């Protein structure tokens, strides 16, 4: 039996609820994951290294007695570099070059500016002492995620960049370790899930407490990241793995099927949805999916995710396509249409957007990591708090001259007195100067 992708129609009256169920249902159960994540964090906070080794054994299926078996030295990273092919080393280095060159152009440092009255203003910019990189490794390996977060941290000057990556059944991915070596990662712990997030956020006897945790992850990593919010810095919690492809029917249906396959091969909980007003095109995408799926090397993962969350949605016209897209509110939108800048005005709820027939998630995954912008010299001219800025701390500076204090204190005194904050007022008035006073 040829796999039959789930078909939906915005004309059918049950579309509203049928769509709401596809986006909402959860097999892992909510509050269930939340409770287990809360329990894991409390354990690592109390029992420390012992808890992480036990959780690593239970959840990752590992056979390690001490924390030391879960710590990879820098030499193990350099050795991984030698165990990968030449094509894979250069591909890692080519990606590293573009990432590193971009972040070097965006790095901003400390500055001072002297006003007319002598007052000095500015910012002190210092790198965070410690940054923690979560690299997902549960159901696949993601080396580009290492480069995307470790390189801007090193460019910022973060002295210690620590990486956690789960090694299921003790299997070690040399391409991911080789990326860590090229990216300048200092230490690699072979742990994952909520226990690894806990170990970096609070610290164990063997895992250092970091200033910021970054990286994508599954429901446990995402849930653990929102809990440690406040205790430790975090980038952005990433929602469930999804792609929404919106096509006008003029893209090769195999490309669209493979684009949906690419998100689907991530994990069995992945959500791949296609929306199009072209009915005959949607039939071809179904024919493309059935033909192409069996040969796929991860056809079991793809079939599972498509069954659970995949959908081919028919809409009446471009306007309905955009309405369905705004309901779905995708973090990643593939605008596979001829006039994609003409569809964007009516698409208000979407994070990263791939536009046209030649761009898909695979390019975003491997070549566009920071804020989902592609690192080039031209894109560098446009500043971002993401990337190098996020691995830096900025302290504002004010150094008043005697005169500058005098003019500022007059204004401060008026407002502070009006608010009965007399200590504010008097500390400012102490510095007001009148040359006629002897």
- Tell me the catalytic residues: 331-332
User: Quick one: 195 or 263, whose CB is closer to a second copy?
Assistant: 263
Interface pick for ligand NAI out of 48, 193, 233, 370 (rule CB under 6 A): 193
Considering the rule CB under 6 A, would residue 218 count as an interface residue with ligand NAI?
A: yes
- DSSP states of 229-265: BTTBEE-----S-EEEEEE-S-S-HHHHHHHHHHHHT
Long-range contacts for 361-368 (Cβ within 8 Å, ≥24 apart)? 361/243, 361/259, 361/262, 361/263, 361/332, 361/334, 362/259, 362/262, 364/332, 365/142, 365/144, 366/95, 366/144, 367/95, 367/98, 367/144
Beta-carbon count within 10 A of 395 CB: 10
Site for ligand NAI, residues 338 to 397, rule: CB under 6 A = 365
Residue numbering of the annotated binding site? 60, 134, 137, 195, 218, 220, 241, 263, 266, 332, 365, 419, 424
In 3D, which of 101, 117, 105 has the Cα closest to residue 433?
Answer: 117
Q: Which of Zn ion, a second copy, ligand NAI, none interacts with 216 (beta carbon under 5 to 8 A by kind)? A: ligand NAI
Site for a second copy, residues 369 to 388, rule: CB under 8 A = 371-374, 376, 378-379, 381-386
Query: Stretches 65-73, 132-140, 335-343, 394-402: which one binds ligand NAI (CB under 6 A)?
Result: 132-140
Considering the rule CB under 6 A, would residue 137 count as an interface residue with ligand NAI?
A: yes
- Cβ-Cβ contacts under 8 Å for 389 (sequence gap 6 or more): 106, 108, 383
Report the residue count for the chain: 438
In 3D, which of 37, 101, 74, 347 has the Cα closest to residue 185?
Answer: 74
Q: Which of ligand NAI, Zn ion, a second copy, none interacts with 107 (beta carbon under 5 to 8 A by kind)? A: none
In 3D, which of 255, 194, 251, 249 has the Cα closest to residue 225?
Answer: 194
In 3D, which of 246, 258, 270, 271 has the Cα closest to residue 334?
Answer: 246
Considering the rule CB under 8 A, would residue 14 count as an interface residue with a second copy?
A: no
Say how far apart CA 115 and CA 4 lie, in whole Å. 70
User: Quick one: 132 or 364, whose CB is closer to Zn ion?
Assistant: 364
Considering the rule CB under 5 A, would residue 365 count as an interface residue with Zn ion?
A: yes
Site for a second copy, residues 291 to 330, rule: CB under 8 A = 296-298, 302
Considering the rule CB under 5 A, would residue 235 count as an interface residue with Zn ion?
A: no
Say how far apart CA 155 and CA 158 lie, in whole Å. 8
Residues near a second copy (CB under 8 A), total? 110
Considering the rule CB under 8 A, would residue 107 count as an interface residue with a second copy?
A: no
Contact 151, 145 (CB under 8 A): no
Only one residue has tokens 């208000």, namely: 348
Q: Which of ligand NAI, Zn ion, a second copy, none interacts with 348 (beta carbon under 5 to 8 A by kind)? A: a second copy
For residue 350, the minimal CB distance to Zn ion (Å) is 11
Site for a second copy, residues 27 to 46, rule: CB under 8 A = none
User: Quick one: 279 or 421, whose CB is closer to ligand NAI?
Assistant: 421
Breaks, C-N > 2.5 A, in the chain lie after: none
Considering the rule CB under 6 A, would residue 267 count as an interface residue with ligand NAI?
A: yes
For residue 379, the minimal CB distance to a second copy (Å) is 5
For residue 280, the minimal CB distance to ligand NAI (Å) is 31
Residue numbering of the annotated binding site for substrate? 241, 263, 266, 332, 365, 419, 424
Cα–Cα distances in angstroms (integers) from residue 199 to residues 53, 129, 212, 228, in the given order: 11, 17, 12, 11
Considering the rule CB under 8 A, would residue 189 count as an interface residue with a second copy?
A: no
Residue numbering of the annotated binding site for Zn(2+)? 263, 266, 365, 424
Considering the rule CB under 8 A, would residue 163 count as an interface residue with a second copy?
A: no
Contact set with Zn ion (CB under 5 A): 361, 365
């Amino acid at each position: 039996a040829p796999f039959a992708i789930r078909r939906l129609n915005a004309a059918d009256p049950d579309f509203g609820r049928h769509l709401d169920h596809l986006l909402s249902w959860e097999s892992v159960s909510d509050d269930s994951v939340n409770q287990r994540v809360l329990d894991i964090i409390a354990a690592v906070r109390s029992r420390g290294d012992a808890a992480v080794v036990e959780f690593t054994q239970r959840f990752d299926g590992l056979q390690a007695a001490s924390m030391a078996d879960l710590i990879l030295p820098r030499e193990r990273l350099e050795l991984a570099l030698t165990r990968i092919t030449v094509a894979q080393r250069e591909a890692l280095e080519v990606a590293a070059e573009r990432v590193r060159s971009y972040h070097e152009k965006q790095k901003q440092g400390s500055w001072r500016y002297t006003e007319a009255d002598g007052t000095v203003l500015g910012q002190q910019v210092t790198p965070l002492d410690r940054a923690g990189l979560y690299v997902p490794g549960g159901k696949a390996s993601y080396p580009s995620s290492v480069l995307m977060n470790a390189i801007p941290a090193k460019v910022a000057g973060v002295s210690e960049v620590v990486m956690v990556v789960p090694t299921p059944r003790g299997e070690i991915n040399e391409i991911v370790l080789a990326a860590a070596c090229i990216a300048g990662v200092d230490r690699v712990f072979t742990i994952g899930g909520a226990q690894a997030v806990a170990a970096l956020a609070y610290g164990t006897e063997s895992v250092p407490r970091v200033d910021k945790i970054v990286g994508p992850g599954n429901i446990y990593v995402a849930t653990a990241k929102r809990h440690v919010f406040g205790q430790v810095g975090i980038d952005m919690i990433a929602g469930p793995s999804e792609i929404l492809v919106v096509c006008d029917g003029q893209t090769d249906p195999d490309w669209i099927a493979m684009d949906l396959f690419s998100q689907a091969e991530h994990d069995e909980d992945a959500q791949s949805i296609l929306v199009s007003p072209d009915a005959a095109f949607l039939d071809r995408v179904a024919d493309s999916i059935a033909r192409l799926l069996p040969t796929m090397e991860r056809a079991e993962i793809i079939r599972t995710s498509l069954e659970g969350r995949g959908a081919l949605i028919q809409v009446a016209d471009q306007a309905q396509a955009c309405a369905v897209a705004n309901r779905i509110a995708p973090e990643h939108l593939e605008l596979s249409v001829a006039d994609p800048e003409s569809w964007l005005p009516e698409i208000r709820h979407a994070g990263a957007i791939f536009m046209g027939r030649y761009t898909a998630e695979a390019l975003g995954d491997y070549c566009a990591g920071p804020n989902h912008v592609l690192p080039t010299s031209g894109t560098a001219r446009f500043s971002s708090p993401l990337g190098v800025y996020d691995f830096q701390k900025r302290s504002s500076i004010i150094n008043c001259s005697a005169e500058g204090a005098s003019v500022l204190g007059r204004t401060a005194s008026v407002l502070a007195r009006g608010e009965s904050l007399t200590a504010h007022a008097r500390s400012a008035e102490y510095r007001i100067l009148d040359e006629k006073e002897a």
